[PDB]
């Protein structure tokens, strides 16, 4: 099935794929794209942060475009990544 919210955390490479996936989105969400936001996002998902927490981190970077944004971000992890780590259970 699926997992909850404990603290998955993505690796340098794992997020690397999101970098180009968030840099483009942030532009569609705001229409101009902000550099300070792209990072504030990569960190959130990378730190297993929660919509509640992440938002606060994207507040000063989006504020009006936080909840709406973070929403697509949290769902991006499964969008940009899609699949890769399944065959071989090893949580550490």
Curated annotation (Swiss-Prot):
Transmembrane parts of this sequence: none
Subcellular location: Nucleus; Nucleus speckle
Processing and modification events after translation: Ubiquitinated. Undergoes 'Lys-63'-linked polyubiquitination by PRPF19 and deubiquitination by USP4. 'Lys-63'-linked ubiquitination increases the affinity for PRPF8 and may regulate the assembly of the U4/U6-U5 tri-snRNP complex.
Domain PWI: 8-86
Free-text tissue specificity from the UniProt record: Highly expressed in retina, liver, kidney and blood. Detected at lower levels in heart and brain.
Disulphide bridges, residue numbers: none
Subunit (UniProt): Component of the precatalytic spliceosome (spliceosome B complex). Component of the U4/U6-U5 tri-snRNP complex, a building block of the precatalytic spliceosome (spliceosome B complex). The U4/U6-U5 tri-snRNP complex is composed of the U4, U6 and U5 snRNAs and at least PRPF3, PRPF4, PRPF6, PRPF8, PRPF31, SNRNP200, TXNL4A, SNRNP40, SNRPB, SNRPD1, SNRPD2, SNRPD3, SNRPE, SNRPF, SNRPG, DDX23, CD2BP2, PPIH, SNU13, EFTUD2, SART1 and USP39, plus LSM2, LSM3, LSM4, LSM5, LSM6, LSM7 and LSM8. Interacts directly with PRPF4.
Annotated disease: Retinitis pigmentosa 18: A retinal dystrophy belonging to the group of pigmentary retinopathies. Retinitis pigmentosa is characterized by retinal pigment deposits visible on fundus examination and primary loss of rod photoreceptor cells followed by secondary loss of cone photoreceptors. Patients typically have night vision blindness and loss of midperipheral visual field. As their condition progresses, they lose their far peripheral visual field and eventually central vision as well.
Function as written in the Swiss-Prot or TrEMBL entry: Plays a role in pre-mRNA splicing as component of the U4/U6-U5 tri-snRNP complex that is involved in spliceosome assembly, and as component of the precatalytic spliceosome (spliceosome B complex).
Protein name stated in the entry: U4/U6 small nuclear ribonucleoprotein Prp3
Organism field: Homo sapiens (Human)
Gene from which the chain derives: PRPF3
């Amino acid at each position: 099935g699926s997992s909850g919210s404990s603290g998955m955390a993505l690796s340098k490479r794992e997020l690397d794929e999101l970098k180009p996936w968030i840099e483009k989105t942030v532009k569609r969400v705001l229409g101009f794209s902000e550099p300070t936001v792209v990072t504030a996002a990569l960190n959130c998902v990378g730190k297993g942060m929660d919509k509640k927490k992440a938002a606060d981190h994207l507040k000063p970077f989006l504020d009006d475009s936080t909840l709406r944004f973070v929403d697509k971000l949290f769902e991006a992890v499964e969008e940009g990544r899609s699949s890769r780590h399944s065959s071989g259970p090893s949580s550490g």
